[PDB]
Write a protein that holds these residues in place. Structure first.
Motif, PDB file in Angstrom:
ATOM      1  N   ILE A  89       0.836  -1.201   0.000  1.00  0.00           N
ATOM      2  CA  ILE A  89       0.000   0.000   0.000  1.00  0.00           C
ATOM      3  C   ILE A  89       0.871   1.251   0.000  1.00  0.00           C
ATOM      4  O   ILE A  89       0.600   2.220  -0.726  1.00  0.00           O
ATOM      5  N   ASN A  90       1.920   1.254   0.823  1.00  0.00           N
ATOM      6  CA  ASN A  90       2.842   2.392   0.856  1.00  0.00           C
ATOM      7  C   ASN A  90       3.528   2.611  -0.482  1.00  0.00           C
ATOM      8  O   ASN A  90       3.729   3.759  -0.904  1.00  0.00           O
ATOM      9  N   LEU A  91       3.951   1.530  -1.147  1.00  0.00           N
ATOM     10  CA  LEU A  91       4.554   1.689  -2.474  1.00  0.00           C
ATOM     11  C   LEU A  91       3.596   2.398  -3.431  1.00  0.00           C
ATOM     12  O   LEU A  91       3.967   3.370  -4.112  1.00  0.00           O
ATOM     13  N   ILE A  92       2.348   1.928  -3.489  1.00  0.00           N
ATOM     14  CA  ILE A  92       1.356   2.534  -4.388  1.00  0.00           C
ATOM     15  C   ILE A  92       1.117   3.995  -4.025  1.00  0.00           C
ATOM     16  O   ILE A  92       1.004   4.869  -4.904  1.00  0.00           O
ATOM     17  N   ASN A  93       1.014   4.289  -2.728  1.00  0.00           N
ATOM     18  CA  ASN A  93       0.700   5.652  -2.304  1.00  0.00           C
ATOM     19  C   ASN A  93       1.854   6.621  -2.501  1.00  0.00           C
ATOM     20  O   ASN A  93       1.677   7.824  -2.262  1.00  0.00           O
ATOM     21  N   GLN A  94       3.014   6.138  -2.947  1.00  0.00           N
ATOM     22  CA  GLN A  94       4.075   7.047  -3.347  1.00  0.00           C
ATOM     23  C   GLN A  94       3.756   7.716  -4.684  1.00  0.00           C
ATOM     24  O   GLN A  94       4.343   8.746  -5.011  1.00  0.00           O
ATOM     25  N   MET A  95       2.846   7.148  -5.462  1.00  0.00           N
ATOM     26  CA  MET A  95       2.425   7.778  -6.713  1.00  0.00           C
ATOM     27  C   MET A  95       1.531   8.985  -6.422  1.00  0.00           C
ATOM     28  O   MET A  95       0.606   8.887  -5.598  1.00  0.00           O
ATOM     29  N   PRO A  96       1.749  10.116  -7.103  1.00  0.00           N
ATOM     30  CA  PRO A  96       0.906  11.296  -6.882  1.00  0.00           C
ATOM     31  C   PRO A  96      -0.568  10.984  -7.078  1.00  0.00           C
ATOM     32  O   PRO A  96      -0.943  10.177  -7.933  1.00  0.00           O
ATOM     33  N   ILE A  97      -1.413  11.634  -6.268  1.00  0.00           N
ATOM     34  CA  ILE A  97      -2.830  11.285  -6.259  1.00  0.00           C
ATOM     35  C   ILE A  97      -3.470  11.541  -7.617  1.00  0.00           C
ATOM     36  O   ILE A  97      -4.380  10.811  -8.022  1.00  0.00           O
ATOM     37  N   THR A  98      -2.989  12.545  -8.362  1.00  0.00           N
ATOM     38  CA  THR A  98      -3.588  12.828  -9.663  1.00  0.00           C
ATOM     39  C   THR A  98      -3.383  11.685 -10.647  1.00  0.00           C
ATOM     40  O   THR A  98      -4.181  11.536 -11.579  1.00  0.00           O
ATOM     41  N   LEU A  99      -2.352  10.866 -10.453  1.00  0.00           N
ATOM     42  CA  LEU A  99      -2.132   9.672 -11.263  1.00  0.00           C
ATOM     43  C   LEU A  99      -2.748   8.422 -10.669  1.00  0.00           C
ATOM     44  O   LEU A  99      -3.257   7.570 -11.409  1.00  0.00           O
ATOM     45  N   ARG A 100      -2.687   8.303  -9.340  1.00  0.00           N
ATOM     46  CA  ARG A 100      -3.219   7.132  -8.652  1.00  0.00           C
ATOM     47  C   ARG A 100      -4.690   6.911  -8.974  1.00  0.00           C
ATOM     48  O   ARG A 100      -5.126   5.767  -9.150  1.00  0.00           O
ATOM     49  N   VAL A 101      -5.471   7.996  -9.071  1.00  0.00           N
ATOM     50  CA  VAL A 101      -6.901   7.849  -9.304  1.00  0.00           C
ATOM     51  C   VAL A 101      -7.200   7.344 -10.703  1.00  0.00           C
ATOM     52  O   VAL A 101      -8.248   6.736 -10.914  1.00  0.00           O
ATOM     53  N   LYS A 102      -6.333   7.593 -11.690  1.00  0.00           N
ATOM     54  CA  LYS A 102      -6.669   7.165 -13.037  1.00  0.00           C
ATOM     55  C   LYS A 102      -5.799   6.029 -13.559  1.00  0.00           C
ATOM     56  O   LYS A 102      -6.122   5.464 -14.607  1.00  0.00           O
ATOM     57  N   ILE A 319      -9.332  -8.479  -6.573  1.00  0.00           N
ATOM     58  CA  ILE A 319      -8.241  -7.703  -7.143  1.00  0.00           C
ATOM     59  C   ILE A 319      -8.061  -8.131  -8.591  1.00  0.00           C
ATOM     60  O   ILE A 319      -7.955  -9.327  -8.876  1.00  0.00           O
ATOM     61  N   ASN A 320      -8.071  -7.174  -9.512  1.00  0.00           N
ATOM     62  CA  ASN A 320      -7.845  -7.500 -10.917  1.00  0.00           C
ATOM     63  C   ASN A 320      -7.226  -6.306 -11.624  1.00  0.00           C
ATOM     64  O   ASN A 320      -7.125  -5.201 -11.074  1.00  0.00           O
ATOM     65  N   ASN A 321      -6.865  -6.515 -12.895  1.00  0.00           N
ATOM     66  CA  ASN A 321      -6.093  -5.519 -13.635  1.00  0.00           C
ATOM     67  C   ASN A 321      -6.827  -4.191 -13.793  1.00  0.00           C
ATOM     68  O   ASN A 321      -6.183  -3.171 -14.041  1.00  0.00           O
ATOM     69  N   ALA A 322      -8.155  -4.177 -13.684  1.00  0.00           N
ATOM     70  CA  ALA A 322      -8.892  -2.976 -14.049  1.00  0.00           C
ATOM     71  C   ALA A 322      -9.245  -2.125 -12.844  1.00  0.00           C
ATOM     72  O   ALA A 322      -9.969  -1.141 -12.991  1.00  0.00           O
ATOM     73  N   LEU A 323      -8.755  -2.472 -11.656  1.00  0.00           N
ATOM     74  CA  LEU A 323      -8.948  -1.583 -10.517  1.00  0.00           C
ATOM     75  C   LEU A 323      -8.087  -0.329 -10.665  1.00  0.00           C
ATOM     76  O   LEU A 323      -6.880  -0.421 -10.937  1.00  0.00           O
ATOM     77  N   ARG A 324      -8.681   0.860 -10.493  1.00  0.00           N
ATOM     78  CA  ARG A 324      -7.822   2.025 -10.300  1.00  0.00           C
ATOM     79  C   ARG A 324      -6.929   1.827  -9.071  1.00  0.00           C
ATOM     80  O   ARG A 324      -7.261   1.076  -8.149  1.00  0.00           O
ATOM     81  N   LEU A 325      -5.774   2.508  -9.044  1.00  0.00           N
ATOM     82  CA  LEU A 325      -4.847   2.182  -7.944  1.00  0.00           C
ATOM     83  C   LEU A 325      -5.394   2.625  -6.594  1.00  0.00           C
ATOM     84  O   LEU A 325      -5.086   2.012  -5.571  1.00  0.00           O
ATOM     85  N   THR A 326      -6.209   3.680  -6.559  1.00  0.00           N
ATOM     86  CA  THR A 326      -6.855   4.047  -5.302  1.00  0.00           C
ATOM     87  C   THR A 326      -7.849   2.976  -4.861  1.00  0.00           C
ATOM     88  O   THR A 326      -7.919   2.630  -3.667  1.00  0.00           O
ATOM     89  N   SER A 327      -8.600   2.407  -5.807  1.00  0.00           N
ATOM     90  CA  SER A 327      -9.478   1.294  -5.449  1.00  0.00           C
ATOM     91  C   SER A 327      -8.673   0.076  -5.012  1.00  0.00           C
ATOM     92  O   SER A 327      -9.080  -0.651  -4.096  1.00  0.00           O
ATOM     93  N   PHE A 328      -7.539  -0.178  -5.667  1.00  0.00           N
ATOM     94  CA  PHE A 328      -6.708  -1.335  -5.307  1.00  0.00           C
ATOM     95  C   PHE A 328      -6.239  -1.262  -3.854  1.00  0.00           C
ATOM     96  O   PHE A 328      -6.301  -2.257  -3.119  1.00  0.00           O
TER      97      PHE A 328
END
Length: 364
Positions: A89-102, A319-328
């Protein structure tokens, strides 16, 4: 929850079960009889039940070791799932939120692994691998936990009665102990014995009543001597006859009493054996009911733990490929949350084993 007294009561039940005699002549020596003439209480009947209890006691340590080792295993499994999930989760949350959501999970895994070369290729491949490994790990813990639960359930049903996981139906050791205990009480002699004692005392007073009336009638027989010769013939005949009616009736009752005292002595013998066997079956039954309650707790605990693992497994399948990273990240939190409960329960059970082991020293 399953407490240290629960585990001690299981060990006490197993120790009692293993100490029961199982050789036919030893069961007879333990019973104090070779035949009792009560259905279900003959030594062969008692031995068959003791054999079943002995075999059930012999099987505890397999269940005990499965339970304790599974708790040790689930402790460190929960710890690893929660800490690795948190790192992911911490690794993913290093991505800026404007990218994480899409951005989709497939963008940072599969879409990096379909073309040709990269550092992001290696980390994306390792991310895909660790998710696959964790999915398989959780499936494995579901499978082993289901087996432990089955062992505990079957151990419990053997004691309570019902259908085992094999499909075999068993009568239940505790209800069988109860049936024999009930037969010992339906067989009790205490009222019969008291009514026989009463009749010995009463006939032993009537035997004495006309030992005195024999002495009376034989005295009466002589009261013709007043007249002399033929007054003694008529007093002798009348009262000599009443004196023998008293003696004859007496000798029927001396034979009656010797029989009735032989009978009541045998009925007392049966009662003494019944009372002894009743006390043993009461001890066995109390150990069984305490063990049954301990297994109720243990079985419920393993059903609850299994339910949490299953909840985690069902979330992981979403969990699958089409989850946005915030949903993941939100779904991965739902995967690891049940494991806090699993680890807490597993560590609690390990600690109960520790405290049960220490109890011996604290008592002695």
């Amino acid at each position: 929850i399953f407490t240290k007294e629960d585990l001690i009561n299981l060990k006490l039940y197993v120790r009692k079960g293993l100490s029961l005699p199982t050789r036919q002549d030893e069961v007879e020596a333990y019973l104090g009889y070779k035949k009792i003439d009560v259905a279900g209480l003959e030594p062969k009947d008692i031995k068959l039940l003791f054999d079943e209890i002995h075999n059930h006691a012999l099987n505890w340590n397999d269940v005990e070791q499965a339970v304790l080792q599974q708790s040790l295993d689930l402790d460190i499994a929960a710890k690893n799932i929660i800490s690795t999930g948190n790192e992911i989760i911490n690794l993913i949350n290093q991505m800026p939120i404007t990218l994480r959501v899409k951005t989709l999970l497939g963008d940072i895994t599969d879409k990096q692994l379909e073309n040709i070369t990269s550092a992001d290729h290696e980390v994306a491949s390792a991310l895909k691998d660790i998710l696959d490994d964790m999915k398989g790990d959780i499936n494995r813990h579901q499978t082993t936990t289901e087996n432990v639960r089955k062992k505990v359930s079957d151990y419990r049903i053997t004691l309570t009665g019902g259908e085992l996981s094999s499909g075999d139906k068993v009568n239940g050791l505790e209800p069988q102990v109860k049936t024999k205990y009930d037969l010992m009480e339906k067989s009790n002699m205490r009222k019969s014995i008291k009514e026989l004692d009463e009749k010995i005392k009463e006939k032993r007073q009537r035997i004495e009543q006309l030992k005195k009336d024999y002495d009376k009638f034989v005295g009466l027989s002589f009261t013709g001597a007043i007249g002399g010769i033929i007054a003694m013939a008529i007093t002798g005949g009348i009262f000599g006859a009443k004196a023998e009616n008293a003696r004859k009736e007496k000798n029927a009752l001396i034979s009656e009493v010797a029989e009735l005292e032989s009978k009541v002595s045998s009925q007392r013998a049966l009662q003494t054996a019944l009372e002894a066997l009743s006390l043993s079956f009461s001890d066995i039954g109390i150990r069984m009911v305490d063990a049954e309650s301990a297994l109720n707790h243990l079985d419920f605990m393993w059903l609850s733990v299994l339910n949490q693992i299953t909840e985690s497994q069902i979330q992981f399948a979403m969990i699958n490929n089409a989850l946005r990273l915030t949903s993941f990240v939100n779904k991965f939190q739902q995967v690891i949350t049940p494991w806090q409960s699993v680890g807490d329960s597993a560590r609690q059970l390990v600690d109960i084993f520790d405290e049960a082991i220490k109890e011996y020293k604290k008592v002695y």
